Symmetry: D2
Subunit: 329 residues, 4 copies
Amino acid sequence: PALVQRRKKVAMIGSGMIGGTMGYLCALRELADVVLYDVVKGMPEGKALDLSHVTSVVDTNVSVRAEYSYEAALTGADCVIVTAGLTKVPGKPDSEWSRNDLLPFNSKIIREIGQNIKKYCPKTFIIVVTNPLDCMVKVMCEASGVPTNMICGMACMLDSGRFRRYVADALSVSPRDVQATVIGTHGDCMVPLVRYITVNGYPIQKFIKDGVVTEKQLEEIAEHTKVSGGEIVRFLGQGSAYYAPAASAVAMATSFLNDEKRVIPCSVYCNGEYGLKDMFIGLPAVIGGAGIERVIELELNEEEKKQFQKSVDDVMALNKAVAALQAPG
Amino acid sequence: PALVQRRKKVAMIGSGMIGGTMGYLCALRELADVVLYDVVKGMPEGKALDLSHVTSVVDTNVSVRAEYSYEAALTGADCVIVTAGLTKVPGKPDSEWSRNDLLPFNSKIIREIGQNIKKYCPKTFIIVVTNPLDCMVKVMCEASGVPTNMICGMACMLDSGRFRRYVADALSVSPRDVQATVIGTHGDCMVPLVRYITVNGYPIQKFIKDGVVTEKQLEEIAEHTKVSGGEIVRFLGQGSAYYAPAASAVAMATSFLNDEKRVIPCSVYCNGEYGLKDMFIGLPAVIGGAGIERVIELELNEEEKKQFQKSVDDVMALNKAVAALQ
Amino acid sequence: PALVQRRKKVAMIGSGMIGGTMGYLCALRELADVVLYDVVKGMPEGKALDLSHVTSVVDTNVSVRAEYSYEAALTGADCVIVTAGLTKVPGKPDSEWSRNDLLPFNSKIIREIGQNIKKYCPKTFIIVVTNPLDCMVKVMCEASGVPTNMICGMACMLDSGRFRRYVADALSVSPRDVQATVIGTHGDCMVPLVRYITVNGYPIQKFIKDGVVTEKQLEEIAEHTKVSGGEIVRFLGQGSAYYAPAASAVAMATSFLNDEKRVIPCSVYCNGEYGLKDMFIGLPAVIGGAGIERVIELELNEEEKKQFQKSVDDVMALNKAVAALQAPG
Amino acid sequence: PALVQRRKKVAMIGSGMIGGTMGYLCALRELADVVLYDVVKGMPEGKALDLSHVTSVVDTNVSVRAEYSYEAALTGADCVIVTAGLTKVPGKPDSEWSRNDLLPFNSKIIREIGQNIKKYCPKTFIIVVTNPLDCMVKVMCEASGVPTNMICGMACMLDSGRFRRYVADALSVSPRDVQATVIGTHGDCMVPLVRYITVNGYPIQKFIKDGVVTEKQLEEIAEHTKVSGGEIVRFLGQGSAYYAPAASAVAMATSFLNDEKRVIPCSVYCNGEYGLKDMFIGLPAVIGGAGIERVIELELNEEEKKQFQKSVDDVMALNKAVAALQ
Ligand SMILES: NC(=O)c1ccc[n+]([C@@H]2O[C@H](COP(=O)([O-])OP(=O)(O)OC[C@H]3O[C@@H](n4cnc5c(N)ncnc54)[C@H](O)[C@@H]3O)[C@@H](O)[C@H]2O)c1
Ligand SMILES: NC(=O)c1ccc[n+]([C@@H]2O[C@H](COP(=O)([O-])OP(=O)(O)OC[C@H]3O[C@@H](n4cnc5c(N)ncnc54)[C@H](O)[C@@H]3O)[C@@H](O)[C@H]2O)c1
Ligand SMILES: NC(=O)c1ccc[n+]([C@@H]2O[C@H](COP(=O)([O-])OP(=O)(O)OC[C@H]3O[C@@H](n4cnc5c(N)ncnc54)[C@H](O)[C@@H]3O)[C@@H](O)[C@H]2O)c1
Ligand SMILES: NC(=O)c1ccc[n+]([C@@H]2O[C@H](COP(=O)([O-])OP(=O)(O)OC[C@H]3O[C@@H](n4cnc5c(N)ncnc54)[C@H](O)[C@@H]3O)[C@@H](O)[C@H]2O)c1
Ligand SMILES: O=C(O)c1nonc1O
Ligand SMILES: O=C(O)c1nonc1O
Ligand SMILES: O=C(O)c1nonc1O
Ligand SMILES: O=C(O)c1nonc1O
């Protein structure tokens, strides 16, 4: 008979660690059919088979397939999560790992992906993961031409997740009940909002007064959060983090697909917020069936605005750089 | 084959609406084996059968059984959730529904149950649901003799859930990301903490300034929260709320069984907080594998202190009343 | 701002025990927005509020609303689950409880609901629960006018669920791994297929031969399966089963909404299978995004056919009777 | 104060692709605290951090830690899943990938792990993943000394899952409703039981007559099932499958931890089944809180017996070789 209820379809443009991991989450939760795309042939087919096998093991039913062309991968995609790109620059020490160094390597790739999205699934919801995150979201937006509410970058939910895990451990509570947020550009200038930490809505200041945690401790946690990415890179030796990044991107995708209207900080288009225009940066936002339904503007104090400004300078510098060096075509 | 990993066991003392609903959640999530106990003959066996059938439907495997003796029901229970008692006073108009009026009807029941827990499962974690909640938790504590960290009353998670749902609707966000809390005695004097409302940790104040919600609107939400129980009582015509109450109690039991350390407001033992002693009252707490592992003493503003004092007078009056009834 | 991913909507026509319970499952699993409808004023609103509160407790976000008009309740409904109707004949002792006795009390109600679906949501997938099940499914089909693949009745999954739980207990295995099926009409003539019982595909016969279970034990399990409904009715005192019935109906709706293609025995339209035409009866079927995508025809032996023919005669007799007494409007 | 409900603990001995992936499943489902152990220093701490971050993202609370020593990794482990070892022989072409060739490379590693399990967590449930599986499970059994019912090898649930996925696609149904089983030795001689294929208990035979699938197609599916591991190895270029293997091992661990009593084909200790003794081989089993609670000995036809004998010869040769090596 005629198909009335079509499963959601999520296209993983880039089938590396994060791409495969996100595909895993979709199969495990029967969230949507999955398509794995990558310039590397063979590997996506291997992961697609492995993942298809998972559905039987966990008693779920979604189709996991590798697609070789942009057309086959992107057509019909309800959401496109882009992880295509390099994680580390060849020959550079792990101690010098920087997301900004990936700019000259990933700009072209992201732009091309965006051009194909415009061509095959202009009505999709785009979740960019590729670094330098905030810069790549803007490139993707320009290239894909999708409405600004239909594109965002995953980063701050990951950064906040780290922030929350550390706070949760310090307070001996589930991270579910720790509301800790990191805003700004995903990089060395990200801004963990220590002043805004709450335990189920209760100000962190109360736990300082109670003698459970110290201000010093919280700032060390903020610092740890800022450098958590490099910490993992150095520990792993090869590649970078993927389990939390994948879980974060899928949580965002799920909030869109199920119109959950979850409040998740992510790289979103600024049209006046915090004083920013025509650019993307990590901010608290509401993700619903209409994409980014709201950008939350927090009341920042002097020091926070100073930190945020440095975060802004980081991404703005990268945005002018990319524009200056961009090929006409 | 010697058993190494024994499933958790949850005894539902009271197999009415809430008891059966909690058994449902256990079966649906394969959380633990379930024992349905009740004074009523037959009904528990019916619900136990129905629930056991659920395991096949949803592909889980837990044992749901009815037990009519305190010994069979309580022995080996990792957690005991008590809902036994009346929901409404006979002949009392729905418009006059008051949890406090249930005192003389449920006080002896709770005491008896506590005495049996003391006898059959003194190491269990007790979650009281029966009203008047905060007063009954103390009665249960006195009768069961369990350590103060191993007994609490489900109430404020329900009140907070309502508070959160209303706020969630007003802001158009998932209630998962609304942290709203109600503390104090579960009744007309419960205390919704409007001031502490956060949206994923972001102060509700900025949302007010942004025009998403008004202060009047929030106060209305707080009032709606306080009278949500009666609202449902009147809509249903018979009995009272059970879906949210059941989910709240199981969420608490789950945080204990899996040592999650969730921050959940509930009726906990006061060891001096706010100057309160030898009583139970709704406060934010941390539920873990060691039971109540933390009780949060939030700073209250003038209005909150006034409202909290009234909440305290309410439960203290109840406790005085039960003491005189024993 | 424009909505791209709209949540699925399930309408509970009948907000009694099963209706409310199904709404609970939807809110608990964030499966879809829920609408509770019932001729009884007040109660549906109390339950909708209770259920809306659950979403907060379990951290999900679906809308649960009571609607008192057929239009508000049915419009936009991706799936409609009908439980509206009587559970027991007033005055009749529990020892004589019979689903067929409910025919004169529920036939008109089901027809009316069908007429409303035809008007407000002709593209919906209808799941009938109201007894007498198989006859009500036909009345609903004739009244709603939906394609035969877009309507079925929940019953056999419940009967099979009981069958499975009893076998699982006898074998000391999870019922997930017990494939036991009951076919035919949901009533005293239902047919528990003992010969077809399998433990993860392994035939029950081997377990008898190896002395794990006896022939009498399985017979008692089949009998118990047949009378389970009356058993619960007599135990409860008031009303009938609702926890497993609700979970069964929702499992069916979920297979449809998520195009899972689960194989679930339910009351489906027969177009030649088992030699039956223009009628609904409990049979194994595949529920997917296109509704009933396949009706499985099992090879029945002599005794099974004899039992099945009895269930067929039961529903055929009721079908002729209901049609003869049907009010033209 | 005192902990009454302790979370389960699963130790991942080997933190490579599969070890990390199983840790992911535990964190995602809040199944148990996780310990990641590996000979490679640094990497496990990296994955542990990454996984701990996941708990915040998905709102769960389990501890994920890397442990340098066997003592810290094994002590208190309710279940130990072993994936330590090589995936392919250095320098060997992908077209020549064979699990049996890994024998000399992993046998010593498995034995050492077993001795440490005996020392630090003798009461744990051991799930071996390391190839050559069936041989390695026996090595693990002899070295660990755990009860015969407290050790098994994950493999057939994976082979069966593949078998089920292919059949599910051919029939257009959810694999949840396809019961397809592969028994024997995890390798080129594994035995997909085509004759036992059922669709929710309905014989595949009828589906063949109905023309949904042909006998020749089912045989092609059986062959594909047998060579699925190599197919993935060749596609990936480096390493081998890990998503389904991880999910299979954890499904098994969960059936044990929650005493689900699921029927999962796995490498189990033989006490005469098929005339097999003192060895492990893939057979249908029941995994509950008491470990392997039942081994199902299916009736096989002539062809299946022939294929099964080859499967037996395969592992017997391996065990014979192992005994000669160490
Ligand atoms: N925003 C965040 O918080 C966050 C977190 C982790 C990683 N990242 C970034 O995500 C990206 C992917 O990370 P990963 O761990 O999956 O890396 P990975 O190396 O495992 O996978 C990247 C994949 O991209 C593919 N690729 C390269 N060029 C391509 C092209 N032109 N078209 C299609 N595919 C192409 C590669 O072949 C490779 O399979 C990196 O750029 C990394 O820095 C961001
Ligand atoms: N704390 C809260 O937030 C909250 C929320 C909802 C309801 N409640 C209270 O929970 C209680 C139960 O509510 P319900 O909806 O399940 O009611 P219910 O009437 O459906 O069930 C109560 C059950 O208690 C049983 N019972 C009575 N006396 C007993 C005894 N001596 N021993 C064992 N069982 C006995 C009854 O037979 C009945 O089955 C009520 O007292 C109600 O006021 C509290
Ligand atoms: N197929 C099965 O396996 C199965 C299993 C259980 C129950 N059932 C049947 O399901 C039906 C409902 O069971 P229940 O336990 O929920 O019963 P219930 O009595 O709790 O609820 C029935 C609800 O139907 C409502 N109703 C009556 N007439 C209506 C109308 N014209 N329009 C809208 N609502 C109307 C009633 O007001 C009541 O709230 C019964 O007929 C029962 O026999 C079938
Ligand atoms: N049974 C099955 O169905 C099945 C399925 C897939 C893989 N496997 C087998 O599982 C094993 C692991 O596969 P993988 O994909 O995780 O491989 P992998 O290479 O990703 O991980 C193996 C890990 O083992 C560690 N290791 C090596 N020697 C060790 C030692 N002495 N002590 C502790 N750790 C040690 C390595 O450092 C590495 O991190 C392989 O042997 C593979 O053949 C079995
Ligand atoms: O934040 C990280 O861990 C990260 N890893 O690769 N890119 C990143 O941003
Ligand atoms: O709060 C409620 O809804 C309630 N219903 O019965 N007792 C209660 O406390
Ligand atoms: O089968 C049952 O339990 C039942 N209860 O009410 N109607 C039914 O069919
Ligand atoms: O079966 C597989 O896919 C496999 N991959 O590595 N070892 C194995 O057994």
